[PDB]
Amino acid sequence: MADQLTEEQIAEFKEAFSLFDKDGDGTITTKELGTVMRSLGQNPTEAELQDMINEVDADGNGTIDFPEFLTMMARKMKDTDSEEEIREAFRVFDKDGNGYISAAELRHVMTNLGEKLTDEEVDEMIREADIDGDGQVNYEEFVQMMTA
């Protein structure tokens, strides 16, 4: 409908998918669909992934094929969540509106709220959100780094 994949894009997606295949079975784990999509620079939510996986988990087996991976890829390519929406979303968690968020306040909301970072993923986020080590992230700069 909105767009159709070019043979070169299908080749890049197949090349990345080959790292998750590795052994030559040509199929990827139901949760690992998110990892190949994220390797391909997509920003899917766990709710989006599960809501698509519900259409292909129906026979069991625990894995999905290349054609249905390529279909779920083409579904999320309609509406990847963009820089200005992500920046303004951080602006709702900023308590002053000053353009900075503390490592503690980010650690709070990222563990408390929907789809939750685990503490390992929060420390990995803080490791490069706290860019010069003063304990604050400039979210307006961090979003332009993150959405490139």
């Binding site: 998110g34 990892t35 994220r38 390797s39 620079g41 997509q42 920003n43 899917p44 939510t45 766990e46 709710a47 989006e48 969540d81 929406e85 992500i86 979303a89 951080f90 709702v92 968690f93 909301v109 990222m110 408390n112 709220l113 929907g114 789809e115 939750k116 970072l117 993923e121 990995e124 986020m125 490069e128 979003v143 993150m146 959405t147």
Partner: peptide, 26 residues
């Protein structure tokens, strides 16, 4: 309404981070 809307706003931030995470680590 804003307090429930914070769930979607945080979800979009975390989805963007988990996307960026692969392209950084490999």
């Amino acid at each position: 309404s804003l307090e429930v809307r914070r769930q979607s706003l945080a979800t979009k931030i975390q989805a963007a981070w988990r996307g960026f995470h692969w392209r950084q680590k490999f």
